[PDB]
């Protein structure tokens, strides 16, 4: 089961290897759109803060799970920032959790006065007033319970079928990393001109032992030109300098 | 953007009240994925044993300040510890130090941006239009004209509000080219 969009869940993913080819023979996805990284480069990177959001929405709302969108979900249930790094994955779940009488465990917020902020979780259960009339209970006329359930029936149209949406957001190459693509480590070579890739940070140069000491949280050193001058090796926590070959 | 970021540092000291003069910088202790619209806070103070009146407050001091969007120039030493900084909008001397990327300024005159007056209030003026636009006739019409003989009508003297359709119908396409959808409510149209 997926959480109601009005009360969506998020969990951290760490200390694991990401491999997206495993899903090719698992499910057919209607949406797989990446903004921070092109899909073909996903396997070459390593990520430092990876979270997975889990909620279920209506098919017509799939276009709203994107930066810069409007609508009932984008405005009142779940919104992405314009400065979004990640991938939005969605697929048709009509054959997974619909019910003949309607699956009423999936709810969304219909009425709110303010708009949501990125990654905001609005879980209030209070009655909201549409008019100026004060209310305490009442639950009608000019004030209503803000949540509604979707009529997710196996016989409805395509636009009304449930869809399962997973949004993967992350920080890329700016911190010590915990989730890497399907890569293997090799032996490190010093004092030679080497084409290197350190935790997703590539380049050409000569590696040497460094005389610098990084703070416990600092992973990379950068020069006055805003280029890498040193790296803390991801396999053994040594500080190495990198210099152009000629 | 949903993350509650806490920075911190501990310092040894021997003083009675006011914080010492000096300089230091805090470390990125924790980034919490919370997503809560925080507007107010309260402190938690320890209670010492001696009713609700026989309470011993012990001995402590607490300080509160507020953050502003301000540019700072940071000086790193040979070991990467920040040892000084220039507040780029504290005063003309600090402004000059920031402009030249230096903590030493030579004798002379330095031009440093401008004195700018900021607005004190927001003044919004629109025509006093009280009628709602006929969204019902447009979207709840009994019949639509054949595409070969399409109809057009002028809309005027009304207020546009697109949130009324959210609980009316589900739309497959809503694409705006002249204006981004999020700015539609901030404009006024002539034809």
């Amino acid at each position, epitope marked *: 089961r997926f959480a109601s969009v009005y009360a969506w869940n998020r969990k951290r993913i760490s200390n694991c290897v990401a491999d997206y080819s495993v899903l090719y023979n698992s499910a057919s996805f209607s949406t797989f759109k990446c903004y921070g990284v092109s899909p073909t480069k996903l396997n070459d990177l390593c990520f430092t803060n990876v979270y997975a959001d889990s909620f279920v929405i209506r098919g017509d709302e799939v276009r709203q799970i994107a930066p810069g969108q409007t609508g009932k979900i984008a405005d009142y249930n779940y919104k992405l920032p314009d400065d979004f790094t990640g991938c939005v994955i969605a697929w048709n779940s009509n054959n997974l959790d619909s019910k003949v009488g*309607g*699956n009423y465990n999936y709810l969304y917020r219909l009425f709110r006065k303010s708009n949501l902020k990125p990654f905001e979780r609005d879980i209030s259960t209070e009655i909201y007033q549409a008019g100026s009339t004060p209310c305490n209970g009442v639950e009608g006329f000019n004030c209503y319970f803000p949540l509604q359930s979707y009529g997710f029936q196996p016989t409805n149209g395509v636009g009304y079928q449930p869809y399962r949406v997973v949004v993967l957001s992350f920080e890329l190459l700016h911190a010590p990393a915990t989730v890497c693509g399907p890569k293997k480590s090799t032996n490190l070579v010093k004092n030679k001109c080497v084409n290197f890739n350190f935790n997703g940070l590539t380049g050409t140069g000569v590696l040497t032992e460094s005389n610098k000491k990084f703070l416990p949280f600092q992973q990379f050193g950068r020069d006055i030109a805003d280029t890498t001058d040193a790296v803390r090796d991801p396999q053994t926590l040594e500080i190495l300098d990198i210099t152009p070959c000629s | 953007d949903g993350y509650f970021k806490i920075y911190s540092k501990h310092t040894p000291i021997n003083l009675v009240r006011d914080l010492p003069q000096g300089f230091s910088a805090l470390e990125p202790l924790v980034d919490l994925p919370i997503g809560i619209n925080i507007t107010r806070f309260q402190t938690l103070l320890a209670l010492h044993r001696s009713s609700s009146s026989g309470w011993t407050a012990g001995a402590a001091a607490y300080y509160v300040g507020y953050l502003q969007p301000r540019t700072f120039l940071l000086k790193y030493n040979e070991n990467g510890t920040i040892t000084d900084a220039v507040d780029c909008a504290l005063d003309p001397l600090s402004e000059t130090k920031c402009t030249l990327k230096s903590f030493t300024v030579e004798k002379g005159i330095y031009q440093t941006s401008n004195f700018r007056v900021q607005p004190t209030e927001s003044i919004v003026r629109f025509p006093n239009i009280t009628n709602l636009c006929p969204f019902g006739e447009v979207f709840n019409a009994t019949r639509f004209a054949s595409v070969y003989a399409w109809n057009r009508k002028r809309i005027s003297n009304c207020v546009a509000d697109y949130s009324v359709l959210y609980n009316s119908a589900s739309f497959s396409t809503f694409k705006c080219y002249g204006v981004s959808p999020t700015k539609l409510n901030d404009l006024c149209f002539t034809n």
Partner: antibody
Amino acid sequence: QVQLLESGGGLVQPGGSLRLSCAASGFTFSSYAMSWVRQAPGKGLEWASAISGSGGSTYYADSVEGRFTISRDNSKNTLYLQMNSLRAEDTAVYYCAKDTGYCGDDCYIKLIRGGPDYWGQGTLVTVSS
Amino acid sequence: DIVMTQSPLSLPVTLGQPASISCRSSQSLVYSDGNTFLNWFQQRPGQSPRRLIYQVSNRDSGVPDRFSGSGSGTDFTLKISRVEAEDVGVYYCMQGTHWPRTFGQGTKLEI
């Protein structure tokens, strides 16, 4: 099959109280909403009360609100209704029924659309000195 | 509340002939998602009511295949292809689109 067995039938003096209950089997009790309905002799049927599968959110018909209490105990798959301050108008055959809509831990009553799929055998209570 | 008027109050219709029962609502029974929630139930004397037609026209499971529904908006009709002896009893229309849930007064079919 799905089975609901009504009990608590009989007669109680005006102003008193009685408790009705429905046993259930052949169904996942906690996964669906359940309601109490009734019909006075010679009259059609009306809804009295409902609870979601979780046993939390409740609903009462306005004509009986306050006077009636509806409850569920998932550990015994048993639905209960206790009717206090009994009136002559409360003489009726009572039934339990199971809603077609799926309604679990996150489901709220009054958001359910559709009708009952399963109806019980029924039991009658009257009000008489 | 939804108010439903059924017609006729009783239907003394000859065995073996087509028949129909009308259910006219005070308000539309079509939900904005296109899903209707009008339910036709048959209560025979001595029996607890059992649903016959759901969502205006859909046939339920385990019921005679001689019945189907029809209609839209505020006026719906149950159509009976042939009257059978088992049809004697009272038919009710339940309106599931809004709360409180309501029923019509019922149509008593007789041969």
